Amino acid sequence: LRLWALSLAHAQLSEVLWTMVIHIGLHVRSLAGGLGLFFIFAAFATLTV
Amino acid sequence: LCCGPKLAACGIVLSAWGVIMLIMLGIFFNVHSAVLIEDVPFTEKDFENGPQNIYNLYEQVSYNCFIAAGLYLLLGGFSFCQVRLN
Amino acid sequence: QFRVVKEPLGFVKVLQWVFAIFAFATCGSYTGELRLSVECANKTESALNIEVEFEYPFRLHQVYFDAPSCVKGGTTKIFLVGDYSSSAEFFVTVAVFAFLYSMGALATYIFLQNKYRENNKGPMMDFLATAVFAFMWLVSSSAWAKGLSDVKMATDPENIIKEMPMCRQTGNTCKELRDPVTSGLNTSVVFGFLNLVLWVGNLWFVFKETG
Amino acid sequence: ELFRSEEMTLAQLFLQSEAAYCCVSELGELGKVQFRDLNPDVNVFQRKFVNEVRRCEEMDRKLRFVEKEIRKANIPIMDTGENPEVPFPRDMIDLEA
Amino acid sequence: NNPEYSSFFGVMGASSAMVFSAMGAAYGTAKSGTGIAAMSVMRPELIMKSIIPVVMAGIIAIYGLVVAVLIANSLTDGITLYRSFLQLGAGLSVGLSGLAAGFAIGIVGDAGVRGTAQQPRLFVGMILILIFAEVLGLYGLIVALILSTK
Amino acid sequence: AHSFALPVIIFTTFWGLIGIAGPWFVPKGPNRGVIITMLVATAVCCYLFWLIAILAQLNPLFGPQLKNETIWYVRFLWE
Amino acid sequence: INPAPYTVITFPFLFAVMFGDFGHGILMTLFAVWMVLRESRILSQKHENEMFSMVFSGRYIILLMGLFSIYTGLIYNDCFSKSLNIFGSSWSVRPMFTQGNWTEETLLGSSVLQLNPAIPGVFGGPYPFGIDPIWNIATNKLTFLNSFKMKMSVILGIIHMLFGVSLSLFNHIYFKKPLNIYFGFIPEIIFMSSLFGYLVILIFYKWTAYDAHSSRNAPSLLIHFINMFLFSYPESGNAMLYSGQK
Structure with a gap:
């Protein structure tokens, strides 16, 4: 069952990373939407690598 | 010369992966009207009337991706220009 | 040169290009409407004017309409049936791809005649590309034929009124006001059939020309 | 049928020493034969070929010194290649001399 | 209807999780750093390459949060007495x-x-056993997730 | 709406044909045997794990749930 | 026996089933091809970084793992915890207010609610390829994403132990040692099969045995195995699988 465990852990850690980084980056105004996406996405890239 | 390829290859690959990711994401927000299967969260509280305002908000959400995509094009351009210096 | 302009290949290819840029262009902007009324026993709660609009990509499956329930002043939403955007989306998207390829092929014909007459190899590439496109045209024409027939006996008001859960009681009479007009559908399938047969003719001519 | 470990077995070898120099040179060029020791009880330095061993050592040391000199000369190598160019004369001794 | 003292156990679990996780990571960084100091005198060129256990302590740290953020997001000002x-x-x-x-x-x-x-090449078995000790933490996260399942 | 017999049939013929036709079309060579073994192995492992993957959604024993915003949204979505 | 040729495949697919993400597999393959296309350019370079030396020493292994991680991500139908609409919905739960007795209790109230698979017009056949996205959008998805993945990994391990067992018989063929096979190998295969074959067949049968209309009286997932080992067979609520299984 440890293979299952590793797969489960991978799925849930990826999901929580998504909800922590990408989901919080959601706002109506494009002035910050088109700008802060830079640093939030760089953070996503660094965290996943 | 300044800003050699050793400190800019990472920038180039990051900008390439970022532009492809952002363009695909914006395509998903626009064409699919941001179905919950791809994007649950939204930014509003009152839906008294119907789905038209939800569709419009998803349209401007999809619009917001283009600015960052073009920014990544610009970053890749700067990185490649710095690499061209030797 | 003018010799290949007078040759059937150039005129024929330009002909399919104009037929396509008419056909799929008109397909991508079709629209229409049908009208209905549910004149129940009570005049105060009766409905006299309902409008429902159909338009490209013709996703009837999520079309709907909000009409009064006629029971103590209620209201209910009902959704039509039929998913036709699979075949239609395939046909129009690959038609856009074929349009881009037609632009490329026409550019090669007019500007790269020298690279067109070398070794008689690029004509083979164009030939089997057009063959794949023709097989696609045939299968999508068949799919669109089945889809348009399904739309034909789906948009008929008898289906939706027998779907109306509360029309089964006495006093709930409901007559279609304006029937849907299906000129776009049969015109477009005719356009596609003409494109298919004419692309088959182009394939035959290319088979007879690459020798 | 599938692939197991390969097949190989001990086979003796007679060879005159004078031609054996070139024989073992060629055998090493091929690289496809094992070697072993048949006189274990004798010491390594008691094999009496330690003369060849420490003359190899002193050529090694001299070459290390000239390598250090060239590193101070900061002249990079070019690596022309031609890996099989090692002959079998006694002229090597007075060449390195 | 419900008895009082509902959120107490939830918040206490959230706090204890990170407290003990950080304490473990602290001892890991302790032992790793003093080891690097110990060795570095004779092998100054292995110092960068010998930086393994600290980032693994950081993986126990990122585990700490994945569990901290889960328990925090599930927390609300109302519990059915089962989630507490x-x-x-x-x-x-x-x-x-x-x-x-x-x-x-x-x-x-x-x-x-x-x-x-002293001996360079034995280095790989260190990572072998180290990351077995890491899979222990992975098992901890497993039980955390199956417990939050209910 | 979807079928199960049609998908399972098309994909089992696809992967069985790949596996069975694998060995024969390869020309004679020393790399042939290892290639045959890895091709048959990938065919069988892919096919069995695909069988369990497709069975993953067959004859469900429980009904999922949703949020209320999801109720109205999915109601006004596809179909 | 040389288990290496089989290991060529047996390593990457386990690496992939553990490594369940499509896009990460794409990135890994990008790195792999970046290394491989630079074969000569890396042969000329010297591997000052010895970790990179180990990494290069097995590129082929790296690209195999990358391709199989791509495959596992495809078949899982999960990519950064998200799925895309490719096939149909494959559930199609249209009747909720109609055919199911509900009008309006949404917003403040009825925040979360389960649906009944039993009611007709809600089932759209199994999703043809991968996990149905209803699980992706679902909240208690994890509850049953445990169970089938549990069973899946178990099934995998059992299959592997089976052919692994057969290899020793092959070895003993090539040594001609029937002494250690007559009272040997055959008892191991019987002992192993009698248990794990029983478990795997129980599960294949349990999967399609029963439906939503018999859901609230259906057998469990694993408790019956425990009862079987416990030697205790009370008749009260005996969830019979096939006639005479006792």
């Missing part, structure tokens, strides 16, 4: 499992890294 004890159990389990894994990973990493300073 649940959250407490999750927090205690994850925190102490992080603690024990940090202890093991730290001391074994110190010993191994400060031992490879």
